[PDB]
Amino acid sequence: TKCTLKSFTVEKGIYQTSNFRVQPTESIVRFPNITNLCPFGEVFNATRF
Amino acid sequence: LTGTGVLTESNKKFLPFQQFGRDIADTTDAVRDPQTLEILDITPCSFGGVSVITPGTNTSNQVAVLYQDVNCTEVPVAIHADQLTPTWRVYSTGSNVFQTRAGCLIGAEHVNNSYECDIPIGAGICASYQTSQSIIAYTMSLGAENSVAYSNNSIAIPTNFTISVTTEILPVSMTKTSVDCTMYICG
Amino acid sequence: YTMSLGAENSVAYSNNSIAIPTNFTISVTTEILPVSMTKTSVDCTMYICGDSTECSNLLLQYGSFCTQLNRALTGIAVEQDKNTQEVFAQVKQIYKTPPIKDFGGFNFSQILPDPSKPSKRSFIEDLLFNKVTLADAGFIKQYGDCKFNGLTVLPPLLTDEMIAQYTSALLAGTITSGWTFGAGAALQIPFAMQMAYRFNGIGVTQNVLYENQKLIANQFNSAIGKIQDSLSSTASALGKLQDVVNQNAQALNTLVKQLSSNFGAISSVLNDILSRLDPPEAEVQIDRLITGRLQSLQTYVTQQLIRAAEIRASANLAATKMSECVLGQSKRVDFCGKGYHLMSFPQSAPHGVVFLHVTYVPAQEKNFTTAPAICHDGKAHFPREGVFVSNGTHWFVTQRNFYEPQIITTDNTFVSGNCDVVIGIVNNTVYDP
């Protein structure tokens, strides 16, 4: 309240403040099931080039 | 889609072909996990609905905190009390923890006696600094109750009187400000 | 068509012809006034830059726009609380009606609190609460179920139970004491004698009440019944109040919809801008977005300020009506319903008040011959309080607003001058008791 009002002294009353309290945030990444795989198996391990 | 928030078990029933929920402002509300066919509600992790009740720093430095529309068990998870300074964890749990219809009030001693409102909190609850001294929260009083001894053949007539001088203050004028536009913008 | 102003009605004016009512009606009208808005609050940092450190750092360059917007909204909410406080909290104590309802035959059961109820609201209060739908709001309805997006609706300081208690105290004070409870300590008085006071206050002798008391009571009850029917029939009556709500909702809705605007940037989504462009140009894009959202917030705040000024004017008017209308008896014409004012009864409503104005309306009118004075013995006699009338043969003196002829006597009339001055004086005999 003191800094949000830009003063070292605070009068009586109920002030509405901001939200300075930060919190550490982890990261998550989600993608669908891996499907639709190329023919690389038969391209690299092909019988004859 | 990408975003920031808290993922919680949802209650909705997404259609078989819908993936991402959406509010009326084209904003993500719930999502379907790409691997597990479960719907997760995304509640943003930030609380700005926090009010600080304080008596004047001249009188004391004790304060109370009001969190808007929360239960008293959801407070250390709504504001993430576990990742806060330990001096903020005083004002997230404890013994002075009232549950008003407006939210969670912390640091105010809940009393039963009603008094004239001093610092309005909300939903009929007002707080004040009183006696050794501490902050108290109470259902504000609307005035001392009374009963009129009314009957069809009884009248109350005054016999004395008082000349009362009351004071009504009304603002009349402001300060005649003047701004030099070009000097202010382009001095 | 070319709209008609009203029904043509020529008045049969004549220099010696007066029209005096012979009967009346006790009419109850309804006056609806808004008293408060919804105490909306916006978390500006979370609205503009919801959970994004870089966006918050960029927004911190723009100084204290965000702070002053929050301060303005807090002032608005405080002003609404003050408006409600000043309109309703005008009684020092909390009176309650006695169990006996011997109110001279008048039936107040539709405005006094209902005993078998937890909210202590009257029938009309329940009607008003059930006639204010919230299905057309959108944001104000979806937030009441819990729209957590940095926008919150603070609850009013005085709960509906407290507002009902205040209206109950005012109503009980008015019924059981008249106007004394407003000036100071409540001084009891039979309700019939209070209505006699009011009739004297409108220039109608008190006996008129006592000679037609039951009929008037029935009329009042009937009028209250009609009000019930109106509330039961027309939902749109409280339009104004609903409109207010709607307007606020629309504002909020507009504000919310502004989150979907690019304001000239490449995308309305902050994260896409951050991930897609290099910082030198992502900074320009986020500056565009910040300027756009700040302008939207400024427009919303200005509209809220103007609408709150409107609501403050309405609340001041409502407080003045409560002071001069309930706590007393006003002589201001059409200030407390059409007709001569008798009394008024407040009733709560969602973010507003509804006054039932009980007024007196002349109904059945008769033509009488009139004179400006009467000449008895060369002297001119004028009525002390009333007017001379003639049914064709004899001259009586009656009160102006109700035909009650009385023999002309030296106690009804006062002498002044002689009969050579007054233009239109007639000859008659002033009986001397």
Next chain:
Amino acid sequence: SALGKLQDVVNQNAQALNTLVKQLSSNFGAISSVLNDILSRLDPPEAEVQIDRLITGRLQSLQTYVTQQLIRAAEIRASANLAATKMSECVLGQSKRVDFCGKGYHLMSFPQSAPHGVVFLHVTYVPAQEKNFTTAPAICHDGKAHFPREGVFVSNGTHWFVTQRNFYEPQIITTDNTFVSGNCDVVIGIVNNTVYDP
């Protein structure tokens, strides 16, 4: 604190101005909030962009300040109109409007100036000490019903007086205090008594 309402106003204006001053410290997206530094560090090709950013930001601040001033001035004008009406109907006359000139019945008012405002001292009359009495809406005397001209009938237990309704001043009931109308078979609650005839 009694005159807080005035101070608030003053304070608000000050705050406004103060904020305006602090608004000169903002970049609004520019590379510096100081015009002199931008002019000393950049050529017109990019000084134009920086100064445009500064101009837009400061113009927005000015517009916000002006709109706030306009709305607050409208409020203060409404309050001043109310004060003018209060002076017209409160000092220069005698208002029967309840609570419009202080709690209680209005007697008079005295105005006093004050920095950016006025203070009304409302002198009002307030009943203090009260007594119960038995009352009747009217009294029969000779079959005919008598109603009080101004005031109500009261009884201290044995006798009946007629008193004005704002101050207990019991007077003997006579034919100059009461007027006749009809007969007393209609009034509900009427009581028998004698009307002394001078």
